[PDB]
Structures are given as C-alpha cells and as structure tokens.
Amino acid sequence: FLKNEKDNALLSAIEESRKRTFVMAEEYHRESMLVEWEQVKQRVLHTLLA
Amino acid sequence: ESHEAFNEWFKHINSPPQKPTLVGQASFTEKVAHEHKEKKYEMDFGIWKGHLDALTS
Amino acid sequence: MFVARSIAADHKDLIHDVSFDFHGRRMATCSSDQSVKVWDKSENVNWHCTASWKTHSGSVWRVTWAHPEFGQVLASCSFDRTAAVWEEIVGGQSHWVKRTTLVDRTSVTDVKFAPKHMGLMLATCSADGVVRIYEAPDVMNLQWSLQHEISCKLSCSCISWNPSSSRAHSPMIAVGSDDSSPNIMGKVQIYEYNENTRKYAKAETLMSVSDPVHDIAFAPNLGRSFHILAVATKDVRIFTMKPLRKELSSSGGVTKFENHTVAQFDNHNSQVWRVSWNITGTVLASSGDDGTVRLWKANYMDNWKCIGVLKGDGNPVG
Amino acid sequence: AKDAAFATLISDRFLKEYCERGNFTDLDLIDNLGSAMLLSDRLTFLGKYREFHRMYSQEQFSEAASLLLSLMTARIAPCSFW
Amino acid sequence: ILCSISCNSKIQEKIVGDFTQDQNVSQKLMVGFVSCLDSEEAEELLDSEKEAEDQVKQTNIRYMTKIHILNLLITSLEMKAPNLAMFLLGYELKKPVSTTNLQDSGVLGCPRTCLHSILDILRKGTDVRAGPVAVWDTPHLAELCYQVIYQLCACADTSGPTMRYLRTSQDFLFSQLQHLPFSVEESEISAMNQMSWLMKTATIELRITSLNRQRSHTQRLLHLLLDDMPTRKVRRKILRILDSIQFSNEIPEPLQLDFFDRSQIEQVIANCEHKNRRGQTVCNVKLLHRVLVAEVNALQGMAAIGQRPLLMEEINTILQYVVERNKLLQCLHAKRHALESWRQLVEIILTACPQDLIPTEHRQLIIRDLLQDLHVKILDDDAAQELMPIVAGAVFTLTAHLSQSVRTELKQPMSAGFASIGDSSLHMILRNLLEFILKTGGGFQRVRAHLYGSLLYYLQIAQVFSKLQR
Amino acid sequence: KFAAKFVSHKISRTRWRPVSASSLQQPDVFATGSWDNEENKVCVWATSDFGATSLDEEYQGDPKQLCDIKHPGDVMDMQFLDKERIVTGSSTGTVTIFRHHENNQTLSVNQRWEQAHYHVGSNMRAPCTAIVCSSPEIVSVGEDGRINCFRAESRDVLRTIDDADSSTMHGVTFLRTTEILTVNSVGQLKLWDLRKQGNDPTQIFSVTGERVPLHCVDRHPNQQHVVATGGQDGMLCIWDVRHGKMPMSLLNAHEAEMWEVHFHPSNPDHLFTCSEDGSLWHWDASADSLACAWLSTDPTKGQLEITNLLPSSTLSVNSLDVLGQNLVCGTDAEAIYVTRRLF
C-alpha cells in the first residue's frame, strides 16, 4: 500500500491547509463577535450617561 | 610545561623523514629524481635530528 | 571608415602578389622585375624594405610563408616548372637564401605549406595534373623528400590544405581544375590521406563546379561538425561538407560526404579571380573583372550579404 | 615547453660550443638542473658529465672516473663523446 | 542457448507446447533442469577440489549455469502467461493461475519445482564464499524468488498461492527476517540489495495478511520487529537496520601528475564517466580501458624512451583511482534504493496498519526514538545529499501521524497521558526540526515543503503551553 | 582611499618625482610609461591644482596630465635620475634620458644610447628590462644578459659587463654606491662589484631546488644587507646578503607573477607589492612594536599585517611607487590609481 501511503501524505497536507483555514476563519468570527459586544457595551455606557 | 614539552618531543620523534626507496627498474629520469630525493632526505633528516636534540634538551 | 595610405613602392615591374607573414609584421612582394622584396613594419606603422633580391627567370605564380615554428621560411612556385624554398638568413644582414629547388614537368601553378602539426611539409600543384607533397626531414637543414604524388587527371590551378588539427579528420587537400572542359564537370577534387594505404585517395568531387575554378579556400573549422569550402569560378560558391556516420567495429574508407551549396553569388559581374577568408572565417573577400573587391558576411540567420565595394581610384564606393 | 626535442636541440648547440672551446658556457645553470635533467637523454648526459667535471675539480677522482665509465656504458653519450 | 531462446516473447508458447506434448517428455526436461540447479558439488570424497584448475572451473561452470537459468526464469515471468516460468515454478497451465494448490515437494506426488529448489537454496544460509554471483552483475537469486512471490498479485493473477505456501509449509519470512541485517561487507552492495528486496516483500505480505484479519500472525510479526525491549538497551531491529546504513562515505586521494595536468585529468574523468542504468556516471570497463589507451597514444614520447617505466607506473594509479570512484558511486545508488525501501516500508506499514497499537504510549516512544536517530544521522556534515529527500518525506509522514496521536490522547480519560509525552521532548524535536530546516539549501524545496507541513501539524498540537510557546 | 584615472594606454611604470629632503611639500608630480600599444609614451602628471591653498578640502582631484613625449618601443622600465630627468629602458634596447621643462610643461630627449642592449653576433636589439639610478650614475640590464653602467653627462657607456648572465635579467637595484643586485629568469639573485675588472658575480643567491623566475628586487633603505625579491610564483622572498645563499623568509604574497616590490623609503617597516593577479598589498612589520622585523625567523615574534589596497577585480598591477603619504600604481585596465593618504 505504498501508493496508499503517498495518497495519505497528500491527504495529510490537505488536512493541514484545512486546519489553517479552520483556525483563521474561527479567529475572524470571534473578532467580529467581540467587536459587536464592544459596540453593545459602548451603547449601554452612553445610555447610562444619558 | 614538562608534559607539553614531552608531547611535542613524542610527536616529533614519531615523524622521522622517510628514506627514499628505489624501484628496481627505474628509468634514467627516475634515477636522477632518486638522487635528488636522497639529497633532500639527508637535508630533511639533518634538520629533523637537530630539532629532536633541541626538544630533548 | 577604412583608411588607405599610399606608399611609393617604386617597383621596377608591377608586383603580381603581396603576402603577409603570420604575425602581420612583415610582408613579401613579388614582381615582373624578377625580384622578391621583404618589408618590415616599424613601431611608427611605416613599412621599410629590409631585403630585395632577384629570385627567378619565370612567372612567380604563388608565394607562401611557413609557420613561424619552422623559422622565417618562404616558398615560391613558377612557370619555370620549379618550386623554391627560401630562408631569411640574417647576420642587420638579411639576404633571403635559396635552400632548395624542387624540380619534379610543367608550370607549378600553386604552392602551400601544410598545417604545422603535420611537420614541415610543402604541397605543390602543376598543370600536368599532379599534386606533389614534400617533407623536410630536418627543420634545421632546409633537403626535401618527395612523399606523395597525387594524379588529379585534370590540370591543377590551385590547392588548399584543410587546416583542421582535429585527430578525427585525416589530412585533406582540395585541388582545382582550370581546364575549360566544354563537358567534363568536377573541377574541384578533394583528397584524403588514408592511414591504411599510406596514400592520398580521392574522397570527393564537387560535380556542381562544371565552370573553370580559379581559386579555392577551406574555412577555419572552429569546432563545426562540417567543413566549409569557398570556390571561385564565374561566380562565388560556398559549400558545406558534412562527413557521414560511422561504426567502431571496422573502418578503411574515405567515409563518404553530404555536400550542399549554401551560397552562389553572380554579383561579381566578372570571372571572380580570388577568394580569401579573414582569420576568423566570418568574412569573405572576393575580387573580379569588375575592378572591385567585395566583402561578404552571414548575419545571425545564416543569410550571407555583401558589406562593401571599391573603385579604380582607390575610394570605397559610397 | 617539456620540450624534450628542443631540449636536445639546445643540448646539441651547447655541444657544438664545448667541442670547440674546452669549457661550458653558463656552468651554474647546468649544475642546478635537478630533476629537469630527466627531460631528455641528451640533457641527462650533459648534466651527468658536468657532475663528473665537478667531481674532478673536487679531487673525487675515483667517483669522477666511475661516473664517466657508467655514462659511456649506458651509451647516453653521443657516439663521438666515446 | 535455452535462456537465450527464452528472451523472445512470441515463442514461449510453441516451446511450452513442445515440452508438454509427452508426459515423459515434460517430466524429464523439467526435473532435469531442476536437479541440475541442485549443485551438489563434491561433498565427502576428501574434498571437491582435490585436483586443480579442473574442479575450480567445475564450480565456475556450475555458477554460470545457475546464473543463466535464473535469468531466464525471471525474464519469462514478466513476459506474460502460460510462460515457461509458470511451468518451472509448478503452476499447471490447465489449472487456474489462481486455483493452484502449491504443496511441499513429495506431498500428493508434487514434483520438486523451481520453488522447492530456490527455497532449499536460500534456506541453507549463504555464508558461502560464493555469496550471490550477482556480485559483478545480478541477481542474488533470492531477489528473483522474492520477485516471483510479489508478482503473485503484482503481475495480476498469481494471487497468493505462494504467500499461503510460504506461511503454512516453510515459515519462510520469520526464519529469514531473524537474521537481518546481512553483513555482506564484501558487497555492501549485495547486502543492501538483499535487504531491499526483503523489505518490499515482507511489506506487501503483512499488508495483505492484515487486510484479511490474521492477528496472531501480524501480532508475532510486528511484536518481534519492534520490541527492542530485552525479553526471553537492546536496540529495536528496525533501528539496528538503520544503524548498519552509513550515510557518510569516504573520499579518493587527489590525483598527482608529474608530466600531466591534474585539472584536465579530473575533467576527463568527469567526461568519460557515462551514465550507468542506475544514472551513475561511470566509465566502466568501457571508457576506462579504451580511454586509457587513447590517452597513452596522445602522450607522445619519442626521444626520451628512457622515461617509459615511469609513465607506466603512473597510468596504473590513474586506473586504480577511477576504479575506486566507480565502485563508490555504485555503492551509493544502492544505499539510496535501500533507504527508499526502509522508509516506505516501515511508514506505510505502521501508519496504514489497523490501529491496534495498545500502548499508544509505546507507539509514541517508538516514534520519538526514530525521529531522534534520524535527525542525528542526517545533521551530520558528512551526510550524503542524495539521502535527504527520503528523510524529508519520512519526517512529514511521521509528524502528521504523531500529531494525530497526540490529540488522540488529549481527547481521552484513563498523571498517565502526558506522562511519556515530553514537552521538553516536544521542544527538542522542534529544535532538531528547525535545524534541519535551516541546513536545507534552496535546492531541496521539496524537503522544506515537507518540513513546513510537519511544523504546521506540530503547531496544531499546541492549539505549560504558554511556557512552551515562549 | 584611491583616486582612479582612466588613460587610454596600459601603464607599465609609475614613479614619483623625488622631493628635496629639505622640502615640507608633499609629492605632487609623478611620471608614467605605457606599453602594448602601437604608439607608446612617457607622461608627466600632477595630483594638485597649482593654486589650491585650502588645507581642508577632501582630495577628490583626478590627476592631470602636464605633458607627454612619444617613446619608441614599450617603456620596459622607468626611474627619475633627479627632479628634471627621467630615464627609460625600451623594448628596442635603447636607454633614454628625458628632460622635463617644468616652466613650459614639456619633455625633450636629453640623451640616448641606441645600442645599450643587443645580441652579440646578430647585432639584433635586445629589450632593456630594468634600470636603476643613483645620480649621476645609471645602471641597465637586459635580455642580452648585459650590465651597462652609464653617467648622465657621458655619451659613451662607462662600463659593460658582457655575458654577465646566460639568462634574461628582469630587475636591478643598488646595494651600495659601487655594488648592485640583479635578478633573472632562473631564480637567482646576483651581487656585483662594479669596480671588479672581471665579468663574474661576487655572490649568487637562489632558492634551493627551484628555478622560478625573479621579476623584481628592492633594497631596504637603512639596512644595506636586507633585500626583498618577487617571482613568477607570486612569492615574496626576504634575503640577508651576508647570511648564506638562501632567503631568510619565504612569504606567500600573490596568486600570480609579482611585478614590483618596494620598501617604504622613510618608514621601512612598511613594504608594498603588486601582481599580475591585479592586487596591491601593503605589508606592515611595525605592528608588534635592532633586529630587522623582516629578518625575524620566529613566527611568534613580528605579526606582519597585510592589507590589499585596491578593489577586488583590477587587471594586472604592473607598477607601484611610494613616497611619504602618497602611493601611485599603473594597471592593464588603462588606469592610474593615486592615494595621498596611505596611512
């Protein structure tokens, strides 16, 4: 199954690219959620000041 | 210092000049090259022996 | 912007030839006045006559220099049926001394020293249709031994050694044939030295040269896998000669050739009389009855073109 | 040049000169040929013969004579130096 | 003559038909070939070679015969079928090339075939001075036998009758693998080739045996192969095999010429060294002999006849040197292929193996040791550049799998799961990795790509952590 | 550190005009000889503009040609005899004295010896390979193996040593007022007494077993027994002409032929060498500071500091000259390099 092992190596490389995309995309979504939370907090602070 | 001098002496005594050997069917050019090698060996041996006696002292 | 500066030669009779030495520091001139003169180039780029002597009682047809490894040696050939070898015996007492006269039946039409790696050899050709090859057995004693006679079966007008020093090529000579021969074609023949027979054998005949041949020149090979030959006839012809393939199992032949005419030029406008390559074999000079010298060169697409034309007054054509 | 042929040529020019004057020109060069003496048999003969003359000047008479005999028997000498 | 004939594909058919028309005929021809190869050279009559050149050439002829025969067999096999090879190896043409029942010689009237014969051969244990005649050419014989077993399924259709026969009747692979590595210093080349073929073979073997489900078999096999742990620090056999491969080789004394240019001779050596079938630049006898004669002819020494003995001795040394260089290049391509073998074999095996790796702990320990040793070996200034890509792919695979393994432990429940892990060790591994990354010049982009991939997989494991990152 | 002047001729020789020992003026004028052209010349050059009285401007000044004269043959060697007179050896075997007329910025032929060097028997001209001056005395050597002695005011050759060498002599220097050293194509340094009536050298020095050509020779200014030579192998040899027949030191200096060697005239702990390999090296024997530092046989005493003064990839540096803080050199790259701030 030497050819299978070569195919597996290619598969592992694809998996690594996929994990990179998984991490960066998740981080971007988390950053967007954090920005929305910060905006909500700022609005609450403005309401308290009112 | 005594161990260093002994090690220098011991290296030098174990590196004598090689006496040229004549291969038994040497051409006329190879015999002249041998006499030049033998004169070079006697000179190199004289220098080696003088250095050995200095290191021995 | 070539510049030509006249010198007062003051020749007794018009000199039919001029030959430079291998270094271009000396030249020899020859004339109807029966003399050869030698001229040395000073540091100031001026020419001075350093020797002048009466050489023969016959039309000196050709003059050639030996390679400088054999010393300051000249050969000449003549209508008197002889070739002569000359050595520059200098003391400032130069007096080109006749060392030998080769006397082996008709006008000797051309004379050429062989390439130096073959030793001190001299080829002559004669109107009897024979090429003769002589060797000096001692370079210090310029005695000559007849090594070869090559029967061309046509009047010989000119000869050229193949200058190739490659051990992959046997010694080769091109020969011509002045005979008008209303019919016989093949007026350029190629001879190759055969090591097995110890004789020159006819390797090729350029059948396309049915016109009388006045001059021939092999180009310097400079690492090409094929030879180039210029031929002066009614036109300028350039041939490529490709040697055929081979097997190491056995071999004893002239190894037949594939020959292509790569250029033919009628632009001379008169029977082209001479052809000469520059030292790199990249520019050809030709002369003809039109009273001009023309210069020919290939571009990077192997297209040959003329690149200069001259006048009787000495001015280059605008 | 390793030029052994030209080496022999110059050896022979020096020989013309010595057949004639009874002495070598440029003694110091011949004495220092070393391994270059082996470039040609003629040069070899020249150098060995110069060594023989050196032995003769040093009163090493036996040595000089034996060197001469060996040269003569090896026929390195040209057949007139016999 | 027979083998020569063999070398033409078309005729095999006519030939086989001929051999078989008569029952007596086929029988006799075949078993004659067979007993012939059982070269039982004089055994107990007070010595085989009691006389002289005679029995020496006897043995020589026996050898050449063996050779021609085996070559024939091999060539035939690959051609097609029913091939002369199928008849000689004991596969009946009438029976399906897949339904054939291979039996030990003498069981149910089965004649001794080539199979039985080669088996007997290698079984003896070839400590013999003969070694494999492949020495100056080919095969170790053993090589042809392993090839026939592989083609069982490799060349289609021979299936596994061979593997079933080698497992049940002869316990062949276990008996032979116990003696690895073969120390044929003689031809490190030979030893290496032996090892290579053995590799491919046992590899496909285990693969298919497991694809089936034969656990005990697979068990014993791998158990042994890996337990460097002393039973009844004993380095694991796989690591011992790797220790036997030196990836650094000595270099030839520089050529010295009195009359002659050196730089020119090195250029001439570089030129006439033509490419052998393995892609090695070697003049081989060819260019050597003829090239040396041509050089002697070119060096003209007319006048000074006297200097001849010298030139003679000098050319001899040049010859010796070029010979040594060629020997070395050969030894090198061999090692390259052997390494390929090792790598692929091992890796594929373990990683595609049905994971029954009980102590994933031990699994990882093994991975660790391996990586360590490899790194050590390759980080050496004298390591052959030709072995680098192999190491590279190896590391890539190893690392991805190891990372998966790490998470496979971080994702369970039982101080016993990061116990044998080693972060320091993670770190040292990292260090070695980086070192190798650095040492890799622009040339080996591919190696760097594998290493970048391995590093990325490693970094995913860390996704004490803050301390490790720092 | 160097101003480079391209001059459309290869430069065989460069020399500074000698300054009076009483002058506080830095050397400002030098001469050059050309070679390997159809028309060769001797040129005179200035480094300063006659008029810049600012002590504070960075010398970016290209050297300016003051005057020239056509020189038959290739200027094989060149020396100043004094402030007004330049001596040359020619490839034609002629020795020539030129006079420089500073007021008019012209060169003129003052005197010539057209048969200084020639082969006996053929009367063929032989190249004059080196010259040395000690006013009013001039010595020349050539490919004919002759040593000629001239006096600048004498039309006749004062002395010839015929057949002094059977090999080409390449270099000559004064050991003392009546003694010279020569170097030749067989690796010999020869000592001559110009008063001895015979044609044999007084002494012969050589490296044992090797016949490498020596091209250059210079004498230590203060130590009349210390001599430097350069060879075809690029080796720098240091000699004590009182001690043995062998060099005291053999130093790997260049990768090709060493054309010139010069001790610094006023600070002889410095030495300079130039080569066919295109390099120009400064050697400093002062770095550890009367045992001449150049004669130290102790590799632990006297670290020589060695500096290449020119950029990598010059063509052959055929000549150098050094005077005070100034160095000039000439090259096959049709270039003159000048520095006025060596140290």
XYZ file of C-alpha atoms in Angstrom, chain E residues 174-342:
169
model
C 10.020 -15.405 10.115
C 13.120 -17.711 9.772
C 14.862 -15.446 7.298
C 13.963 -11.990 8.956
C 15.617 -13.154 12.226
C 18.972 -12.892 10.587
C 18.659 -9.263 9.291
C 20.944 -7.222 8.723
C 23.075 -9.339 6.326
C 26.668 -8.282 6.901
C 27.926 -8.777 3.356
C 30.752 -6.347 3.816
C 32.043 -7.882 0.662
C 29.447 -6.139 -1.373
C 27.887 -3.840 0.959
C 26.095 -3.539 -2.346
C 24.863 -7.129 -2.088
C 23.871 -6.880 1.492
C 21.902 -3.766 0.666
C 20.099 -5.290 -2.253
C 19.231 -8.305 -0.175
C 17.773 -6.121 2.414
C 15.782 -4.057 -0.143
C 14.036 -6.883 -1.798
C 13.298 -8.472 1.546
C 11.708 -5.208 2.513
C 9.268 -4.863 -0.342
C 8.346 -8.464 0.121
C 7.577 -8.637 3.789
C 5.765 -5.326 3.293
C 3.183 -6.404 0.839
C 2.970 -9.612 2.845
C 1.913 -8.065 6.089
C -0.327 -5.656 4.242
C -2.438 -8.288 2.691
C -2.344 -10.669 5.672
C -3.829 -7.973 7.794
C -6.294 -6.749 5.170
C -7.528 -10.217 5.710
C -7.543 -10.432 9.607
C -4.867 -12.858 10.677
C -3.974 -11.162 14.052
C -1.732 -13.771 15.569
C 0.380 -13.602 12.507
C 0.505 -9.894 12.334
C 0.959 -9.908 16.090
C 4.005 -12.050 16.330
C 5.487 -10.246 13.384
C 5.304 -6.691 14.480
C 5.806 -7.625 18.107
C 9.142 -9.023 17.370
C 10.120 -6.423 14.808
C 9.658 -3.590 17.273
C 10.264 -4.807 20.862
C 13.840 -3.702 21.206
C 12.943 -4.213 24.851
C 15.001 -7.112 26.155
C 12.955 -10.290 26.726
C 13.499 -14.052 26.786
C 19.332 -1.093 25.798
C 18.844 -3.874 23.044
C 18.134 -1.536 20.166
C 14.938 -2.424 18.137
C 15.756 -4.380 14.899
C 14.366 -1.611 12.650
C 16.817 0.792 14.310
C 19.636 -1.761 14.091
C 18.979 -1.997 10.341
C 19.208 1.821 10.095
C 22.497 1.741 12.122
C 24.012 -0.627 9.609
C 23.446 2.008 6.833
C 26.295 4.585 6.914
C 25.095 7.796 5.284
C 28.537 9.175 5.040
C 31.214 7.787 2.811
C 34.973 8.307 2.396
C 36.581 10.336 -0.422
C 39.753 9.190 -3.021
C 43.285 10.714 -2.758
C 43.709 13.671 -5.193
C 45.449 12.560 -8.448
C 49.080 13.816 -8.765
C 50.715 14.139 -12.239
C 54.458 14.847 -12.824
C 54.256 15.174 -16.660
C 50.488 15.837 -16.722
C 47.826 18.440 -15.723
C 45.510 17.328 -12.843
C 42.532 19.628 -13.590
C 42.486 18.088 -17.102
C 42.501 14.520 -15.852
C 39.574 15.372 -13.475
C 37.727 16.801 -16.462
C 38.473 13.680 -18.473
C 37.354 11.524 -15.546
C 34.138 13.618 -15.350
C 33.526 13.260 -19.079
C 34.085 9.604 -19.903
C 32.135 8.730 -16.826
C 28.974 7.812 -18.764
C 25.628 7.181 -17.098
C 25.022 3.589 -15.958
C 21.401 2.185 -15.818
C 21.163 3.468 -12.262
C 22.013 7.042 -13.565
C 25.592 6.890 -12.121
C 28.357 8.463 -14.166
C 30.892 5.699 -14.560
C 33.362 4.985 -17.406
C 33.226 1.346 -16.508
C 35.485 -1.032 -18.199
C 34.480 0.626 -21.417
C 35.650 4.063 -21.303
C 38.296 3.099 -18.848
C 40.300 0.652 -20.979
C 39.781 2.364 -24.396
C 40.001 5.889 -22.834
C 43.308 4.975 -21.078
C 44.724 3.548 -24.360
C 43.695 6.774 -26.190
C 45.388 8.968 -23.512
C 48.608 6.876 -23.785
C 48.517 7.248 -27.621
C 48.005 11.050 -27.273
C 51.037 11.363 -24.916
C 53.828 11.066 -27.491
C 57.253 10.485 -26.032
C 59.610 9.750 -28.858
C 63.090 10.891 -27.969
C 63.013 10.130 -24.307
C 62.391 6.482 -24.486
C 64.249 6.380 -21.219
C 61.398 7.724 -19.164
C 58.994 4.965 -20.043
C 58.812 2.871 -16.855
C 57.577 5.999 -15.066
C 54.718 6.732 -17.351
C 53.698 3.124 -16.995
C 53.521 3.161 -13.243
C 51.655 6.493 -13.388
C 48.882 5.309 -15.647
C 48.363 2.412 -13.284
C 47.455 4.721 -10.436
C 45.030 6.693 -12.536
C 43.349 3.458 -13.350
C 43.143 2.400 -9.725
C 41.557 5.748 -8.823
C 38.897 5.779 -11.466
C 38.045 2.234 -10.447
C 37.633 3.192 -6.807
C 35.408 6.131 -7.783
C 33.097 3.960 -9.803
C 32.896 1.358 -7.054
C 31.869 4.100 -4.724
C 29.147 5.516 -6.953
C 27.685 2.063 -7.244
C 27.713 1.514 -3.520
C 25.878 4.845 -3.240
C 22.942 4.255 -5.591
C 22.469 1.005 -3.736
C 22.236 2.686 -0.432
C 19.747 5.161 -1.863
C 17.434 2.482 -3.007
C 17.836 0.629 0.254
C 16.821 3.688 2.180
C 13.854 4.181 -0.019
C 12.941 0.659 0.888
C 13.242 1.108 4.562
